């Protein structure tokens, strides 16, 4: 019982802890993508002089 409850919870938590990383992976892409679409569209040199 204690084997097949923690072991079956492990394979369940495995496919959820890795599902958690895919969420953060795709959200990191749209962040860096939308960051790239602004930093170059604004100006590679303009960011330097503005600060």
């Amino acid at each position: 019982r204690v084997k097949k409850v923690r072991e079956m919870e492990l394979i369940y938590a495995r496919a959820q802890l890795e599902l958690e990383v895919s969420k953060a992976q795709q959200l990191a892409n749209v962040e860096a993508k939308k960051f790239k679409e602004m930093t170059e569209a604004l100006g590679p040199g303009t960011i330097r002089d503005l600060a």
Binding site: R1, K4, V5, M8
Partner: protein
Amino acid sequence: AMSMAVESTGNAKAEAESRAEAARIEGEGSVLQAKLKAQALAIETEAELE
């Protein structure tokens, strides 16, 4: 004094013999009960695992 000896031993041991004999029933009973409890929890915890 030989009657005093067989009085104390025969009486006190017979009381201590019965409680040990009763404890044997709990021991053999608990084995069969735990064996039945295994199936009870097995069918419960395994079938509910689905």
